[PDB]
Symmetry: D2
Subunit: 221 residues, 4 copies
Amino acid sequence: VIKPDMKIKLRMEGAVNGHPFAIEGVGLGKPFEGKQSMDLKVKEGGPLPFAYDILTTVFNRVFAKYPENIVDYFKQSFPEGYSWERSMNYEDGGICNATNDITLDGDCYIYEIRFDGVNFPANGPVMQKRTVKWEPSTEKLYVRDGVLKGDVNTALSLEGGGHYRCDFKTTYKAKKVVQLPDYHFVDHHIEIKSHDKDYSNVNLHEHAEAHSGLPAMDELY
Amino acid sequence: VIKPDMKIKLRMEGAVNGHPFAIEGVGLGKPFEGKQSMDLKVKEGGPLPFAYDILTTVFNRVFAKYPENIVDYFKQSFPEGYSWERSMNYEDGGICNATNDITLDGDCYIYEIRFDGVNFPANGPVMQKRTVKWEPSTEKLYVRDGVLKGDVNTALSLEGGGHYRCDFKTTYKAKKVVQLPDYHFVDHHIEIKSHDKDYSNVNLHEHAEAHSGLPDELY
Amino acid sequence: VIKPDMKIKLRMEGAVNGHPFAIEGVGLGKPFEGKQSMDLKVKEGGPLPFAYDILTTVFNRVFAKYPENIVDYFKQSFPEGYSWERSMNYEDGGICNATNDITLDGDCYIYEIRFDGVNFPANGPVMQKRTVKWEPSTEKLYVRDGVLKGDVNTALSLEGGGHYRCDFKTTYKAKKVVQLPDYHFVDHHIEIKSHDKDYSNVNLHEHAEAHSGLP
Amino acid sequence: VIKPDMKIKLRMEGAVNGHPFAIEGVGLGKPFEGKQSMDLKVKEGGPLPFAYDILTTVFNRVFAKYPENIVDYFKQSFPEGYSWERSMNYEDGGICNATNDITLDGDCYIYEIRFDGVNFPANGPVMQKRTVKWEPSTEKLYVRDGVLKGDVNTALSLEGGGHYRCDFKTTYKAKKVVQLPDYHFVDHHIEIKSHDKDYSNVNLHEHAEAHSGLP
C-alpha cells in the first residue's frame, strides 16, 4: 500500500492561551527508515507569540523504522489511515491538547490537525520563546482498551542551560481492525533545521526508530 | 456599568475526541446574588456523543456574590472585560482545555468560548454518558504573576454511585489594570434544570458565592 | 463515646529528604466544636532543616463539628478507632507520605504517625523555611472502593508573598465497619500560634466544621 | 581502584499502607557491564501482603555501562559515595517514597534504604499481587540546579495482560562534588529470577547501559 517515498500535506488550526493561528505544510519522508522532513509556514495569527517548539511534535508515526519482530500498528492501518489525540502536559502548568486525522491519497498523507494550549504564564519559556530544541526521546507504546497508546516524558533545552519538562500521553486510533502489538519503544529525535526570523518558515526533520529495549544481532557475523 | 439584572449571549466552538461541535446560548442572571440562568442550543455536531456535563462549567465569575471585605476582580474588570483559560484534568486522563473571551455590550455579556477535550477512553463515563451531575465545589483563588488564578478539584456523580474526579486550574486575565485580591474562595453549585433526549436543548443554572473561609451576632 | 473535652498524645517518626527526626506532642480539644490545640516538641534529629508547616497538618477528623444531617464517620468509628494514610504532592516536586494510627485509651487519643518526604530542592521554600502558615482550606470527602477518602488542594503562603500549593490525598479506614456518608466537605483552619526559634516547641491549633456546601 | 566485581549488602525498612516490614539482602554485580544480582530475604512483617515488584527498583546507578562520551556521575562519586531520593506515582494513586544512602566498604556497596508506600487500594493489582514484571525502560537523566535528576515513566505487566503505569522521579546527590553530565538516557531491564511462595526469598537481576538517545 505504501511506497518507499511518500509526500505530506497538512493544515493545522489552533490557539495558544486564546489567540488563534493557522499553519499549513508540505513535505516528504520514507516510512521504512523512520525519517521525514517538511516545510511549514504560518498562514494565520502570525507572527506567532509563543515558542515554535511547542508545535514540532504535532507536525505521523508511520515515519518510524519498525523491525519485523515488532508489529507495526501504523503501516497496517492503510489505506484507511488512523487518527490520534494528545495532551502535552508541561512542567509549569501549560497544557497543549492536539488532534490529528491522517488520511492517504496516493502517495501523500493528509493531516487535519487541531491544537489548543492554555495556562502558559507570561514569564515562562513558551510565551517568551526561550526554548532551543527538544532533546531526543523514547516513547512507550502499550495497548489499553483495544487502542494503541503512547507515553513520553521529555524536555526542551533552554538558552543558558536547563530543561523544560513535558509529559506526552497519546491515543492512536486506527480506522480499521488491525493487529495490536506488544509493549515496545520508539526512539525520537526532532529537529528544526532552518527557519526565518519570526518562524514564518520552518524546516523540520524527524528520525524515529522502534525497538524492544534492552535485549543483539551483532554476532560479529 | 452593571445592572442587578443582566443578560447573557454566547457561542462555543470545540471538539471532543476529535469530533467537532458548536453551541450557542442566551440567558440572564443576577451578578450580586451569584445566580444565573441560560438556555443552550446545539448547532453542529449533534447529537453529542459525550456526557454534556463537561461543558456546563465552561458555559463567568461576575456571577459571584462578593462581600465588601473581599476584592472582586471580575466586576472591576468591566466594561472592558476579561478573558480566561482553564485546563480540566479528569481522573482517568481525559483532559479538557477551555477558552473564554468576555466583553459587555450595553447590559449583555458575550462569551467567545473554545473547548477541546482529548484522550477520553471509549469505556469511560464521559463517552458513555454515565454522569449525573456536578457536585457543589469550592474554588481556591490566588494571585500569581500579576493575574488571578482559580484552582478547584471536584467530581462528577455517576449512575451506579461514585464520583469521577476533575482538576480545574483557571487563569483569569483582566484586560484593564485592576486591584488584585487576597487569597479567597468561591463556592459553586451548577445544575441543569431541563434538557431534551439527545441534550440538544439545555437549561443551566449556577449559584456561586465568595468567602474567606472559616471566620451570628444575634444583632 | 467521645466526651466534649479530651486530650491528645502522639509520637511521629519520619525523615525528610532522607534525614530522620522524631516528634512527640500532647494537647486537647473538643470534638463537637471541631477545635483542638497541642504542644509538640522535637525529640530527635533537631533542629529540623525544613519548614515546620509540612508536618502541621499530620498532627484527626475527630475534631470536626458535624451537623445532624451529615454522617460523622470518625466519632462513629470509636471507641474501636481508625487509621489513615495520605500523600501530599507539592507543586515543585516534593512529596510527603504520612500515616496516622488512631487509638483511644480512656479519654485520650493516641497517635502512631509515620511521615516521609522526598525530592525537596535546596532553593525551594521548604528547605529554606519560607512558609508562613497554611491558608484555610475546604476538604472534599467522598466514598470510593468501600472506603472514605478526603481530597484537599490548598496552599502555603510564603513570606515575600505568594502561595505554594499542595495536593492532599487522604484515605480513611475505620477499624470497625461504620455507616458511610455522602459527598460532603470539611473546612479547616490550622495555625502555629506559638513556637521557639528552632521550632523545638510548637503550639498548634486547628478549627474545623463540616458542611454539605452551597444549597 | 574499584574492581570489575563488587559485592552488595543491604537493608531496607519501611511500610506499605501503614504496615511495617524489613528486608535484607546480599548480592554481586559488575558496574562496568551494568549487571548485578542479589538475594533478598524478608525479616519483619512477612508474609508481605503487597506486590513485591514495587520494591525491586529500590533494591544504584553505578551498575550501568557508561560509554566514554558520557560522563559517569556515579563511579566518580566513589569512594565517598552518594545518596538518592525518589518518588513513585502509580496511575491508580498509590505512591511510594524511597531513600537510599550508598556507602563503600572495601569492595562492597552498603545500602541504607527507607521505603514508604501509601494509598494502595484493596482491589488494585498491588494489594492483590497481580503484577508480573517491570517492562524494560529508559530513564532520562539531566541536571537541575546543580543536582543530577532521573526521570523514567514505566508500567508493570499485569497477569492476564495489560500494564500498570508508574512515574519515577529520582534525585541523585553525590556526597562529593562531581562533574555533571549532559542529557542522557539509561536503559533498564529488571527480572525477579527466583522466588518463594510469599516472596520471603527473592533473587533479583538488573541490566543497565547509558546512552545519548538517537542521533
